[PDB]
Amino acid sequence: PQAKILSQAPTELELQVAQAFVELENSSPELKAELRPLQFKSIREIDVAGGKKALAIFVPVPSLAGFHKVQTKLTRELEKKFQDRHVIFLAERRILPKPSRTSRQVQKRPRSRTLTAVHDKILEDLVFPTEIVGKRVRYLVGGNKIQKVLLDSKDVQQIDYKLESFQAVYNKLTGKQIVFEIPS
Amino acid sequence: TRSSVLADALNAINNAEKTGKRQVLIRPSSKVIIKFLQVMQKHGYIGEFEYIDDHRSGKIVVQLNGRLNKCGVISPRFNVKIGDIEKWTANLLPARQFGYVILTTSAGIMDHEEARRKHVSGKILGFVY
Amino acid sequence: GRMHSAGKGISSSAIPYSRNAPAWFKLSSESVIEQIVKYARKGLTPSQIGVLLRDAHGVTQARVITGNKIMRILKSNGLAPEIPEDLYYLIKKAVSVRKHLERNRKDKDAKFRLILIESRIHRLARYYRTVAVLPPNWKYESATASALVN
Amino acid sequence: VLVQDLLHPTAASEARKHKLKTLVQGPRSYFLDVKCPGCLNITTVFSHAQTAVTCESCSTILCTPTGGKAKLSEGTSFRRK
Amino acid sequence: SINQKLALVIKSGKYTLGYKSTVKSLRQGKSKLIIIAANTPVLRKSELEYYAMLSKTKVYYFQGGNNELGTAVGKLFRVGVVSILEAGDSDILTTLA
Amino acid sequence: SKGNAFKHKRALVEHIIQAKADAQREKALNEEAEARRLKNRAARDRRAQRVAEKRDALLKEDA
Amino acid sequence: STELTVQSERAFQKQPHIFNNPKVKTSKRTKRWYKNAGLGFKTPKTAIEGSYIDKKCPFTGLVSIRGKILTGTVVSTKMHRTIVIRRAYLHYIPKYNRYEKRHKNVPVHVSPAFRVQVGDIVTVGQCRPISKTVRFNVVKVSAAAGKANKQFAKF
Numbered sequence: 001p002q003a004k005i006l007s008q009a010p011t012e013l014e015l016q017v018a019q020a021f022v023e024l025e026n027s028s029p030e031l032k033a034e035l036r037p038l039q040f041k042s043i044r045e046i047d048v049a050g051g052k053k054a055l056a057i058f059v060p061v062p063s064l065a066g067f068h069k070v071q072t073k074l075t076r077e078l079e080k081k082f083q084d085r086h087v088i089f090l091a092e093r094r095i096l097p098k099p100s101r102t103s104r105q106v107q108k109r110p111r112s113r114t115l116t117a118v119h120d121k122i123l124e125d126l127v128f129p130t131e132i133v134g135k136r137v138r139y140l141v142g143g144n145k146i147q148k149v150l151l152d153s154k155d156v157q158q159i160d161y162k163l164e165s166f167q168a169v170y171n172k173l174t175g176k177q178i179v180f181e182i183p184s
Numbered sequence: 185t186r187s188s189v190l191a192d193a194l195n196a197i198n199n200a201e202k203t204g205k206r207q208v209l210i211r212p213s214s215k216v217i218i219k220f221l222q223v224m225q226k227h228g229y230i231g232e233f234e235y236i237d238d239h240r241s242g243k244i245v246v247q248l249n250g251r252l253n254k255c256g257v258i259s260p261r262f263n264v265k266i267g268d269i270e271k272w273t274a275n276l277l278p279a280r281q282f283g284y285v286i287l288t289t290s291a292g293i294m295d296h297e298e299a300r301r302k303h304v305s306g307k308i309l310g311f312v313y
Numbered sequence: 314g315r316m317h318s319a320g321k322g323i324s325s326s327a328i329p330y331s332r333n334a335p336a337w338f339k340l341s342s343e344s345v346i347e348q349i350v351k352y353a354r355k356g357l358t359p360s361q362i363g364v365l366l367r368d369a370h371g372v373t374q375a376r377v378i379t380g381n382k383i384m385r386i387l388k389s390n391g392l393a394p395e396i397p398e399d400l401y402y403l404i405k406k407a408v409s410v411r412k413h414l415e416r417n418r419k420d421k422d423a424k425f426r427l428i429l430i431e432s433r434i435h436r437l438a439r440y441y442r443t444v445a446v447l448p449p450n451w452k453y454e455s456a457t458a459s460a461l462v463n
Numbered sequence: 464v465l466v467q468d469l470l471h472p473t474a475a476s477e478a479r480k481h482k483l484k485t486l487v488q489g490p491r492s493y494f495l496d497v498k499c500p501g502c503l504n505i506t507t508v509f510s511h512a513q514t515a516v517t518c519e520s521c522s523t524i525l526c527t528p529t530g531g532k533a534k535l536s537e538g539t540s541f542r543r544k
Numbered sequence: 545s546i547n548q549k550l551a552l553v554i555k556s557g558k559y560t561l562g563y564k565s566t567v568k569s570l571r572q573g574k575s576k577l578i579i580i581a582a583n584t585p586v587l588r589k590s591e592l593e594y595y596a597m598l599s600k601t602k603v604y605y606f607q608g609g610n611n612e613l614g615t616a617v618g619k620l621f622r623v624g625v626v627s628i629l630e631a632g633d634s635d636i637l638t639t640l641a
Numbered sequence: 642s643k644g645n646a647f648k649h650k651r652a653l654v655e656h657i658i659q660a661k662a663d664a665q666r667e668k669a670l671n672e673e674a675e676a677r678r679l680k681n682r683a684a685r686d687r688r689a690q691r692v693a694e695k696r697d698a699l700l701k702e703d704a
Numbered sequence: 705s706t707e708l709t710v711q712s713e714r715a716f717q718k719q720p721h722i723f724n725n726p727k728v729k730t731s732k733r734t735k736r737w738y739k740n741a742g743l744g745f746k747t748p749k750t751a752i753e754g755s756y757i758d759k760k761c762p763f764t765g766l767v768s769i770r771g772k773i774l775t776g777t778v779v780s781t782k783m784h785r786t787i788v789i790r791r792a793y794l795h796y797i798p799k800y801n802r803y804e805k806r807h808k809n810v811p812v813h814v815s816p817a818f819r820v821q822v823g824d825i826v827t828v829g830q831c832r833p834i835s836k837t838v839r840f841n842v843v844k845v846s847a848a849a850g851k852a853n854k855q856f857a858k859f
């Protein structure tokens with residue numbers, strides 16, 4: 001049961017999330033063909049600077065469409081039973097290094113496997129329910145580089161409390177500073 | 185047609201400096217334009233600059249502190265050797281003490297003084313003072 | 314602008330910033346795909362299919378709804394034409410002008426326009442031979458050219 | 464004026480501007496849900512539909528092509544999006 | 545309009561070209577529509593019309609000679625009469641022209 | 642032959658043998674390409690995507 | 705070149721000093737001599753199992769590759785076993801600090817072990833004077849894809 005929905009052996013912590021999945025599936029009207037064949041890869045744990053922790057779920061790339069249909073209900077229920085946590089869904093997208101001049105020819109790297117595209121794709125899946133409506137990059141006079149993300153004001157009530165945790169995870173997985181702002 | 189997007193960007197900045205404006209819009213915001221502006225930003229010739237990401241090629245708004253006299257390009261990007269760097273700085277810069285010839289080099293885009301410290305040389309992009 | 318005119322009009326379509334759109338669309342991506350094929354069975358060009366989907370349906374763009382572009386779908390489904398659409402419409406226009414020029418010798422404006430159209434034909438065909446869409450030695454004959462547009 | 468905020472123009476200024484000349488270009492067109500008089504079927508219609516869009520019930524006209532926005536056929540009901 | 549419907553039936557449907565095949569198709573009842581060029585001889589035209597009256601099949605009069613008719617069906621030989629054995633995706637039969 | 646440049650019978654015979662060799666080589670590589678795409682892709686997509694690609698991917702390893 | 709009348713001449717074409725003994729019958733029916741030209745150029749399989757002679761071939765003939773290794777674009781294959789390659793280059797003019805396009809046509813002897821067309825990028829190697837103008841032999845050809853797959857008729 002647990003190993004069915006988990007697709008890996010280590011470690012202890014995600015088994016509870018696997019235990020959370022098998023016990024939240026007592027919602028049979030929606031479980032059929034919308035919650036059962038949907039298994040994830042791994043859990044990452046990231047400390048939010050505000051005094052809480054972030055839960056990152058690593059998803060197979062051709063499984064995202066399943067998770068997105070049930071993401072809003074799965075997130076709110078998982079957060080409810082796992083208070084003092086903010087849970088997100090991140091696709092496991094392989095990044096290939098840029099070929100060097102002296103390097104030998106592997107097959108041509110697709111644009112989906114570039115570091116820039118994956119990081120932009122990380123950001124889109126990070127803030128899933130609302131649509132990104134504009135990105136800015138502030139090249140600070142001291143040499144820094146702060147990216148700014150604009151969000152469409154619809155449905156932002158589901159992500160207001162998670163904005164700081166969004167910055168913590170993205171800075172953890174990319175090493176790049178980022179801020180959010182919702183035009184209205 | 186648009187042959188040099190860098191020349192278009194620096195021309196917009198020059199016309200903004202002459203009119204006394206403290207901001208200017210730049211389209212279509214290449215990597216060379218970002219790299220050229222970062223050298224300007226490093227030496228205090230410009231202030232902040234932000235990159236509007238439309239999905240076409242990007243736009244840039246640069247904050248101008250009024251400390252910049254001129255920033256041109258050198259088209260074509262002539263091949264510059266180590267001995268030829270001083271000749272270019274004599275021709276384009278007002279004084280030996282300040283101003284910078286900007287070069288594109290395999291070590292990266294840098295000013296002419298940083299090119300001497302790393303002992304690298306390449307093609308000339310422009311100048312700033 | 315205007316390769317063969319003094320015009321400088323812009324007159325373009327500003328497509329949305331969103332690549333997933335518009336969240337009110339409920340039709341399946343596959344549902345659009347065999348609707349594209351259905352219109353292609355009807356003989357419509359990829360431009361005409363895109364216009365009809367935009368108007369009658371709510372398909373803003375086939376690329377932001379399906380996985381890829383309309384001509385790519387037609388080629389994947391095996392409905393690509395012998396020559397590309399824009400080249401076909403240029404030769405169709407040149408056939409009309411040459412047919413008009415046969416009855417109107419004294420239409421020297423039409424003679425001038427025909428040179429402009431055939432300049433666009435030869436430029437476009439050179440690109441299509443370069444990008445290997447068209448076979449090498451493919452040539453707009455200008456005499457038997459009405460065969461490939463009828 | 465020599466000092467202005469190019470990143471945050473007033474929303475009235477961008478409304479007056481051309482669709483290609485805004486800070487990020489975007490369409491000023493939209494889509495419509497039209498109520499044909501004969502029945503209660505929903506046919507999505509583009510604002511600049513430029514063709515006589517038809518439903519399956521009233522197979523004459525649901526909108527009329529013009530130089531700009533399409534002209535809905537004078538007896539229908541519509542809502543945006 | 546007419547030339548695109550003729551183009552679509554050639555690419556997607558069944559047809560036959562020429563006088564001896566059109567008469568044979570009319571005699572067998574397998575034709576749904578015959579198209580006759582403008583410069584078709586009136587004795588041939590009146591005889592193809594008369595078989596089609598017996599076959600009770602529609603006849604379309606092509607504005608253009610055998611050269612224009614041959615071009616309109618994707619051929620580069622002269623075609624005097626075209627019979628549509630059955631249309632493919634073309635609406636040439638359904639449309640009144 | 643109605644044109645010039647077939648100087649005699651032998652010149653045309655050599656041209657025919659050369660033309661037959663070139664056409665046969667072009668025909669052989671065209672069928673070799675056609676037999677390659679049918680055998681290695683069309684048949685492989687028919688069977689090596691349905692019968693066993695849904696066996697070792699996610700179903701039997703779900704146990 | 706395993707066919708098309710190897711012995712099409714007045715003289716019996718053969719590799720010199722390679723003796724095909726008619727008493728002992730080795731299971732090959734033709735003793736074929738070959739070598740590797742060196743400089744990391746693999747001897748083609750067509751030269752291994754072919755029946756041509758070509759005393760000017762760099763793998764089966766009497767000529768050795770030594771000197772300069774060049775690269776050019778084939779512009780003519782009309783001669784028998786000889787091609788012309790185009791070597792393009794930029795000539796620097798110091799006064800204007802700029803370059804100009806320049807080219808040289810180099811006649812090259814091509815072995816029947818290779819099949820070159822007009823437009824193939826070919827690597828040639830310096831040899832002894834083959835003829836009045838030829839001082840090079842083809843040692844490598846770079847016809848990989850050609851992009852002609854999409855240039856065919858569709859269904």
Ligand SMILES: [Mg+2]
Pocket residue numbers: 314315316317318319
């Ligand atoms: Mg012009």
Ligand SMILES: [Mg+2]
Pocket residue numbers: 316
């Ligand atoms: Mg021009």
Ligand SMILES: [Mg+2]
Pocket residue numbers: 314321322323
């Ligand atoms: Mg313009």
